[PDB]
Amino acid sequence: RFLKVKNWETDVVLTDTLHLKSTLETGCTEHICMGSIMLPTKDQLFPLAKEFLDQYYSSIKRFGSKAHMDRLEEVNKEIESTSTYQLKDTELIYGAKHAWRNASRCVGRIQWSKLQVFDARDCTTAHGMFNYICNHVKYATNKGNLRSAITIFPQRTDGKHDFRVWNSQLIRYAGYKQPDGSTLGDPANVQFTEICIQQGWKAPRGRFDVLPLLLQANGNDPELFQIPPELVLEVPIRHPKFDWFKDLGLKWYGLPAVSNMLLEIGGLEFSACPFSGWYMGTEIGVRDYCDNSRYNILEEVAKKMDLDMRKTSSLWKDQALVEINIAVLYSFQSDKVTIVDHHSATESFIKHMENEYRCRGGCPADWVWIVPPMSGSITPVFHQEMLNYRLTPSFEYQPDPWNTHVW
Amino acid sequence: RFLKVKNWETDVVLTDTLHLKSTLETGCTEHICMGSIMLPVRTKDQLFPLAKEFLDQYYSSIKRFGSKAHMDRLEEVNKEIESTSTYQLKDTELIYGAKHAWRNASRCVGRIQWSKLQVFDARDCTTAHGMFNYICNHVKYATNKGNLRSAITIFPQRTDGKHDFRVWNSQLIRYAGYKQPDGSTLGDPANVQFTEICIQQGWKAPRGRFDVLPLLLQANGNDPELFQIPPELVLEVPIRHPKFDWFKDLGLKWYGLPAVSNMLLEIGGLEFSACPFSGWYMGTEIGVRDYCDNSRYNILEEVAKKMDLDMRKTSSLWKDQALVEINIAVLYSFQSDKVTIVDHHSATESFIKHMENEYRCRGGCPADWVWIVPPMSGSITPVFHQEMLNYRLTPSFEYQPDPWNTHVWKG
Ligand code: HEM
Ligand code: HEM
Ligand SMILES: C[C@H](O)[C@H](O)[C@H]1CNc2nc(N)[nH]c(=O)c2N1
Ligand SMILES: C[C@H](O)[C@H](O)[C@H]1CNc2nc(N)[nH]c(=O)c2N1
Ligand SMILES: NC(=[NH2+])NCCC[C@H](N)C(=O)O
Ligand SMILES: NC(=[NH2+])NCCC[C@H](N)C(=O)O
Ligand SMILES: [Zn+2]
C-alpha cells in the first residue's frame, strides 16, 4: 500500500501515498515492466466528473459543503440532460494546472501553479484559432522572458467536431526529402512538412524554416497560416570560444510549445490544448542537434574541433556533445532568452518532489524521461528512485489527425 | 500474447514472446511502475517443480527433450528430492545454469559474451581457506595478465540456511573506505561499513586511499575468516590522461578485474549464495560512477579546477566537461596498459546486436533500460533509443541481504 522511494546519494527516504489515488493503467504488470516503452457515455462521465469535483472542492477546503453538493448535482443534471457538461472557469484553470502537476514525464513541474490559462472555449474557426495562438505565442515569448501558458480550445462532443492543431509543436523547423536521399531540415517533420505542401504551403526549402500552422476547427478541414515572423523569437547558436561555431549555421527557436496532446479534465476531453514553457538546454543541444535521426550534427562539430574520430574510445562524440550544449546555453543566455541547464533543472525537480511528497503524499515521475540525455548520473535525479503512475486531470497522447480525419 | 518493442532511431520493431515464460514478479502493477526502484529455505513441495522446469529447459537446449535420458534424470531428481529434500546438479547442468543466469540478467549490458563464460565448480569446497584458494585461482585465471576472461566460481548450495557459504565482500577486489573523525572519508565511501567489519575481525588497515580489501570468507555457515589476496595477483592501472600531464598527479588508480561477489545464483530451485563472477569493465563504471558519484571518490571539482573551468555557474557545464576528460583518461590508461576495457559506445552498440539476435533466436531479451543506458551521454548511445521489456527468467542472479545483517555468530 504505502510505498517508499530512496535517493541513493542522500539516503533520504520518502513515502508515497498519492499513488493510491491512481486511476489509469501504466502498461506494466506484475510480470513485465514496460517502463521504457514510449507509448504503452453518460454513465462513464458522471463518475469522472464526480472524482474531479471532489478533488476540486477538497482543494478549496469545501469538501462536502452545500456548494460542493450543489455543483455536483448541477453537473449531474446537466450530464443526464446534455450528455456532457461545461467546467466553471475556476475548474478549467484548476484542471489544467493539475494536468501539468500530474505530468510524470515533465521535469519542470516546480512551476506548475504559475501556469497562465487562456480559455479559448468560445472559438469556432481556424482563423479564430490562429488569433488565439498568435496571442499565446506573444504572451508566452514575452520578449525572451518566457512565461508558461496553455490555450484551451472547445472540448470534444461527438468526435466529429474536434479542434486540432496539426503541428506537433506551435513552432518547429520544416523537413524535406532531397534527391540525394538525405534529408533537408528537420527529419522529424519531413512528413508534416509534406502535408502542408499537400495543402498549398510554399516551402522555402531551407535548413531552419519555421513551419506554418495547420489548424482544424469544429471538425472541418485544416487551414494554413504563417506565424508573424516578428512573433517567433530565434537564437543564433555560437560558442563562447569557437568562433568557427557560428559558421555551422545553427539556430533554434526560443518557445517550446507542445500542441499535439489531449487534456482530460473530469472526463471531458480537450483535443486542442497547446502549452508552452521554456527549454532545458539538453532538449536542443543533445536531442534536436545530436540525435542521429534529427539534425545529426556530431561529426561535423568533432571535425571542426579536430578530434580523433578514428576510435570511439577517444570519446570524441562525448567531447563534442558537451561543447555543443555549452553553446546552446551560452547563446540563449546571451540573447536574454529564458533557458535552464540540466543541472539546475534536475536540482529544482528534486526540491519539487520533496515539496510534493510533503504536501501531497507523492509525485508521479517517469525516471526514463526525467533523467537528462547527457551526464545522467552527475544530475541528482539519476540517483532518485521514482514511482510512475497515472493521475487525472492529465495530458495524454492522441493519434496524429491526418490518420483519423475524414475530409 | 505478443509484445513489440521499437527502436525509435531505426524504426526496427521486434516481437517478444519470451516474456511468456516469465514466472517471477517485477514489482510493478497495472497501476504503478517501479522500474527505477533499485531493489523492488525451500520445501520439497516447491522444489521439484522448479527442478523440472529447469531440467525441461536444459534437455530442450541439448535437443534431447523427451528422451529416455531426460525422463531418467527427472525420475532421479524426483527420488533424490523426496529422499534428501534437495538434489545435486550434474556438471553439465551447472554450466548451462550459470551461463543462462548471465543470459537472463536484465541489468547486464555485456551479455553478448554469455555463452563464453568459464565456470569453476567449487561445490566440493568445505572451508574458508578452501574458498580463498578457489578465489585466488579464479582471479589469476580471469585476470590473465590483462587479457581478461569472464568467469564464475560456484561454491556449495544452501541446505538448511544455517550452513551458507558467503563471500562477505561485495566484489573480490575493492578499495577500503575509512570514516575520519572530522567527517571526511578516506578511500572509497561505498566500502566503509565493510572495512569496519574487516578491521574488527583483525585486519590491519594501511589506511590509504586505495587499499585493496582483504577477503572475508564464510564456509558452511561458520564465522568468516580474513585472507589477503596475493598482491601479485591484483592487477591495477595508474590513471593518466593523454593530453593533460597533471592528471597522473591526482594519484588515481583502479583495479582491472570487476568481480561481483555478493549475489545469489538460482538454478532449478537450488540456491548458490556464494557465486563470485567477473568480466571486464565498461569505462563509465569507473570514470562516471566510482570516480564522480558525489557518494564515491567525488573527484569532479578537483579535476575541474586543474582544467581551470568556469565553476561559477552550472550552465558553464564544467561538470560535464570534466566528466568527459576523466572518462577519456580511464579508457586511455587501461588501453595503454593492455588491460581489457570497453567504452560505452562500443558496449551499447554490441548490446543492441546481441538483443536483436536474442529476439530472433530466443523470442526476446529481458532488459532493464534504467541500468542498460550508460550514466553519461545517454542519448548518443543506441540503447537510449531502444524500447525494452523487463521480466525475470530463471536461472538468475538475485540480490541477497548483506551477511553481517543475518549471520548467527558462533564466536
Ligand atoms: C516552464 C518550463 C518547463 C520546463 C523546463 C519543462 C521541461 C520538460 C522536459 C525537459 C520534458 C521532456 C521533453 C522531451 O523530451 O521531449 C517535458 C515533458 C513534458 N512536459 Fe514540461 N516543462 C515545462 C513546461 C510544461 C508545461 C507548461 C506543461 C503543461 C502545462 C508541461 C507538460 C509536460 C508533458 C505532458 C510532458 C511530456 C510530453 C511528451 O510526452 O512528449 N510542461 N517538459
Ligand atoms: C564480459 C564483461 C561484462 C561486461 C562488460 C558487463 C557489463 C555490465 C555493466 C556495465 C553492468 C552494470 C554494473 C553497475 O552499474 O554496477 C553489469 C551488471 C550486471 N552484470 Fe555484467 N558484464 C560483464 C560480465 C558479467 C558476467 C560474467 C555476469 C554473470 C556471470 C554478469 C552479470 C551481471 C549482473 C547480474 C548485473 C547486475 C548487477 C547488480 O545488480 O549490481 N556480467 N554488467
Ligand atoms: C525508447 C525510450 O523510451 C526513448 O528513447 C525515451 C527515453 N527517454 C526519453 N526522455 C525524454 N525526456 N524524452 C524522450 O523523447 C525520451 N525517449
Ligand atoms: C535510483 C536509480 O534506480 C539508481 O540510481 C540506478 C539507475 N541506473 C543505474 N544503472 C546502472 N548501470 N547502475 C546503477 O547502479 C544504476 N543506479
Ligand atoms: N521544455 C519544454 N516545454 N519542452 C517541450 C518539448 C520540446 C522538445 N523536447 C524539443 O526539443 O523541441
Ligand atoms: N563490468 C562488470 N563486470 N561490472 C561489475 C560491477 C562493477 C562496479 N560497477 C564497479 O564500478 O566496480
Ligand atoms: Zn514498470
PDB file of N, CA and C in Angstrom, chain B residues 134-162:
ATOM      1  N   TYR B 134      40.214 -21.250  -4.047  1.00  0.00           N
ATOM      2  CA  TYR B 134      39.427 -21.205  -5.289  1.00  0.00           C
ATOM      3  C   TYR B 134      39.372 -19.775  -5.834  1.00  0.00           C
ATOM      4  N   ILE B 135      39.235 -18.810  -4.934  1.00  0.00           N
ATOM      5  CA  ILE B 135      39.139 -17.433  -5.357  1.00  0.00           C
ATOM      6  C   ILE B 135      40.448 -16.903  -5.937  1.00  0.00           C
ATOM      7  N   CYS B 136      41.581 -17.328  -5.392  1.00  0.00           N
ATOM      8  CA  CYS B 136      42.847 -16.865  -5.944  1.00  0.00           C
ATOM      9  C   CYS B 136      42.971 -17.387  -7.377  1.00  0.00           C
ATOM     10  N   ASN B 137      42.586 -18.634  -7.578  1.00  0.00           N
ATOM     11  CA  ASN B 137      42.652 -19.257  -8.906  1.00  0.00           C
ATOM     12  C   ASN B 137      41.752 -18.587  -9.930  1.00  0.00           C
ATOM     13  N   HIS B 138      40.562 -18.196  -9.484  1.00  0.00           N
ATOM     14  CA  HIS B 138      39.612 -17.506 -10.329  1.00  0.00           C
ATOM     15  C   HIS B 138      40.230 -16.158 -10.745  1.00  0.00           C
ATOM     16  N   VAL B 139      40.733 -15.405  -9.775  1.00  0.00           N
ATOM     17  CA  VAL B 139      41.315 -14.108 -10.092  1.00  0.00           C
ATOM     18  C   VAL B 139      42.485 -14.210 -11.078  1.00  0.00           C
ATOM     19  N   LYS B 140      43.361 -15.177 -10.860  1.00  0.00           N
ATOM     20  CA  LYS B 140      44.518 -15.328 -11.740  1.00  0.00           C
ATOM     21  C   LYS B 140      44.058 -15.750 -13.137  1.00  0.00           C
ATOM     22  N   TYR B 141      43.127 -16.693 -13.192  1.00  0.00           N
ATOM     23  CA  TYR B 141      42.616 -17.157 -14.478  1.00  0.00           C
ATOM     24  C   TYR B 141      41.918 -16.019 -15.215  1.00  0.00           C
ATOM     25  N   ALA B 142      41.029 -15.327 -14.505  1.00  0.00           N
ATOM     26  CA  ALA B 142      40.249 -14.248 -15.110  1.00  0.00           C
ATOM     27  C   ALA B 142      41.093 -13.058 -15.524  1.00  0.00           C
ATOM     28  N   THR B 143      42.081 -12.724 -14.702  1.00  0.00           N
ATOM     29  CA  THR B 143      42.950 -11.602 -14.993  1.00  0.00           C
ATOM     30  C   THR B 143      43.815 -11.874 -16.221  1.00  0.00           C
ATOM     31  N   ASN B 144      44.385 -13.073 -16.300  1.00  0.00           N
ATOM     32  CA  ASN B 144      45.164 -13.485 -17.473  1.00  0.00           C
ATOM     33  C   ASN B 144      46.120 -12.389 -17.967  1.00  0.00           C
ATOM     34  N   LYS B 145      46.855 -11.792 -17.037  1.00  0.00           N
ATOM     35  CA  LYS B 145      47.803 -10.727 -17.341  1.00  0.00           C
ATOM     36  C   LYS B 145      47.221  -9.540 -18.118  1.00  0.00           C
ATOM     37  N   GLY B 146      45.929  -9.256 -17.939  1.00  0.00           N
ATOM     38  CA  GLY B 146      45.337  -8.115 -18.619  1.00  0.00           C
ATOM     39  C   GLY B 146      44.407  -8.470 -19.762  1.00  0.00           C
ATOM     40  N   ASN B 147      44.526  -9.692 -20.253  1.00  0.00           N
ATOM     41  CA  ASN B 147      43.669 -10.155 -21.316  1.00  0.00           C
ATOM     42  C   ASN B 147      42.528 -10.861 -20.560  1.00  0.00           C
ATOM     43  N   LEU B 148      41.628 -10.062 -19.990  1.00  0.00           N
ATOM     44  CA  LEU B 148      40.533 -10.596 -19.175  1.00  0.00           C
ATOM     45  C   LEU B 148      39.618 -11.650 -19.779  1.00  0.00           C
ATOM     46  N   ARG B 149      39.283 -12.632 -18.944  1.00  0.00           N
ATOM     47  CA  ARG B 149      38.405 -13.729 -19.329  1.00  0.00           C
ATOM     48  C   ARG B 149      37.259 -13.819 -18.325  1.00  0.00           C
ATOM     49  N   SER B 150      36.017 -13.860 -18.815  1.00  0.00           N
ATOM     50  CA  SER B 150      34.858 -13.950 -17.918  1.00  0.00           C
ATOM     51  C   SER B 150      34.864 -15.294 -17.200  1.00  0.00           C
ATOM     52  N   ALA B 151      34.484 -15.276 -15.929  1.00  0.00           N
ATOM     53  CA  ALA B 151      34.469 -16.497 -15.145  1.00  0.00           C
ATOM     54  C   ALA B 151      33.582 -16.374 -13.927  1.00  0.00           C
ATOM     55  N   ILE B 152      33.220 -17.523 -13.367  1.00  0.00           N
ATOM     56  CA  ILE B 152      32.401 -17.561 -12.164  1.00  0.00           C
ATOM     57  C   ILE B 152      32.827 -18.776 -11.363  1.00  0.00           C
ATOM     58  N   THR B 153      32.847 -18.649 -10.042  1.00  0.00           N
ATOM     59  CA  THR B 153      33.220 -19.775  -9.209  1.00  0.00           C
ATOM     60  C   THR B 153      32.000 -20.048  -8.360  1.00  0.00           C
ATOM     61  N   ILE B 154      31.541 -21.295  -8.380  1.00  0.00           N
ATOM     62  CA  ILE B 154      30.333 -21.654  -7.649  1.00  0.00           C
ATOM     63  C   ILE B 154      30.566 -22.571  -6.456  1.00  0.00           C
ATOM     64  N   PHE B 155      30.384 -22.004  -5.261  1.00  0.00           N
ATOM     65  CA  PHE B 155      30.566 -22.733  -4.015  1.00  0.00           C
ATOM     66  C   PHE B 155      29.301 -23.537  -3.679  1.00  0.00           C
ATOM     67  N   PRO B 156      29.373 -24.464  -2.701  1.00  0.00           N
ATOM     68  CA  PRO B 156      28.209 -25.282  -2.328  1.00  0.00           C
ATOM     69  C   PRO B 156      26.905 -24.516  -2.111  1.00  0.00           C
ATOM     70  N   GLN B 157      25.798 -25.128  -2.533  1.00  0.00           N
ATOM     71  CA  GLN B 157      24.471 -24.540  -2.414  1.00  0.00           C
ATOM     72  C   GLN B 157      23.942 -24.525  -0.995  1.00  0.00           C
ATOM     73  N   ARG B 158      22.915 -23.712  -0.789  1.00  0.00           N
ATOM     74  CA  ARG B 158      22.280 -23.606   0.519  1.00  0.00           C
ATOM     75  C   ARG B 158      21.606 -24.933   0.846  1.00  0.00           C
ATOM     76  N   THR B 159      21.582 -25.287   2.124  1.00  0.00           N
ATOM     77  CA  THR B 159      20.941 -26.521   2.561  1.00  0.00           C
ATOM     78  C   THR B 159      19.807 -26.141   3.501  1.00  0.00           C
ATOM     79  N   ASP B 160      20.114 -25.988   4.785  1.00  0.00           N
ATOM     80  CA  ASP B 160      19.086 -25.598   5.743  1.00  0.00           C
ATOM     81  C   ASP B 160      19.094 -24.092   5.978  1.00  0.00           C
ATOM     82  N   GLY B 161      20.022 -23.380   5.345  1.00  0.00           N
ATOM     83  CA  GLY B 161      20.074 -21.944   5.536  1.00  0.00           C
ATOM     84  C   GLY B 161      20.908 -21.560   6.744  1.00  0.00           C
ATOM     85  N   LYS B 162      21.410 -22.567   7.451  1.00  0.00           N
ATOM     86  CA  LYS B 162      22.252 -22.351   8.615  1.00  0.00           C
ATOM     87  C   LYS B 162      23.691 -22.734   8.281  1.00  0.00           C
TER      88      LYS B 162
END
